[PDB]
Design a binder for this molecule. Structure first.
Ligand code: NAG
Lengths: 49, 50, 49, 50, 37
């Protein structure tokens, strides 16, 4: 059980082919018409985990 | 064609931009903008020997 | 355009990013342009907002 | 040096202004580690594929 | 002038980054001096 939860929380540092692994940096740097593409990559990657 | 190449997410520099500054608040749930770092939390002094 | 804004766009007319439609245009060197000079029309640049 | 990216529409920032990995509106509140600028000259034609 | 070869032991390691870390085992991928050279 410890291994499963340890690996789940370490998946948040991956990028899944995006600009950065933090939502705030993406939102504060890119415009909404374009930043929605970058966020879509994190959502699909984190939903799989 | 002037190219204004730059990097990000490194040691902070003087070149930031035209924004103001405020005082400090502690032990309160407050958003922070410590030179790009955006988020919320509670700020407390400790003994982390940097 | 739905994306990007220009000097006239951000100060006179901004197009929404979620825009569904067509834009049609053509030269008006004789329709809206006077052969002796066109100055009746005006454009705004000092909205400050 | 504290910069000011409000130099838009002063002499001639027209024709091409597209950015990469950043939006033009968000320059005013982004602090950079370094700023790198070059001002080479080209033939001003189809060779603009840089 | 006069040359020789000797073992480098386990020297040639530094602090790759200025990010503070405590009680962790980080795995870096930087340029180093290979051990026992
Ligand atoms: C280093 O170089 C010397 C001479 O080239 C050689 O004798 C030696 O085996 C090499 N390796 C070590 C670990 O000394």
């Amino acid at each position: 059980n410890a291994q499963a939860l340890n690996t789940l929380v370490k998946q948040l540092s991956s990028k899944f082919g995006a600009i950065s692994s933090v939502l705030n940096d993406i939102l504060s740097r890119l415009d909404p018409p374009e930043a929605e593409v970058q966020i879509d990559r994190l959502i699909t990657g984190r939903l799989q985990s | 064609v002037v190219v204004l190449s730059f990097e990000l997410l490194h040691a902070p520099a003087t070149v930031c931009g035209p924004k103001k500054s405020t005082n400090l608040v502690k032990n309160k749930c407050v958003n922070f903008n410590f030179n790009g770092l955006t988020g919320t939390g509670v700020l407390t002094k400790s003994n982390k020997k940097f | 355009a739905p994306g990007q804004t220009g000097n006239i766009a951000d100060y006179n007319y901004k197009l929404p990013d979620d825009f569904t439609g067509c834009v049609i245009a053509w030269n008006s060197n004789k329709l809206d342009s006077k052969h002796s000079g066109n100055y009746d029309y005006w454009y705004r640049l000092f909205r400050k907002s | 040096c504290v910069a000011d990216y409000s130099v838009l529409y002063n002499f001639a920032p027209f024709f091409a202004f597209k950015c990469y990995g950043v939006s033009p509106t968000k320059l005013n509140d982004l602090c950079f580690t370094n700023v790198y600028a070059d001002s080479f000259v080209i033939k001003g034609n189809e060779v603009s594929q840089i | 002038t006069t040359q020789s070869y000797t073992n480098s032991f386990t020297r040639g390691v530094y602090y790759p980054d200025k990010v503070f870390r405590s009680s962790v085992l980080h795995l870096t991928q930087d340029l180093f001096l290979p051990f026992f050279s």
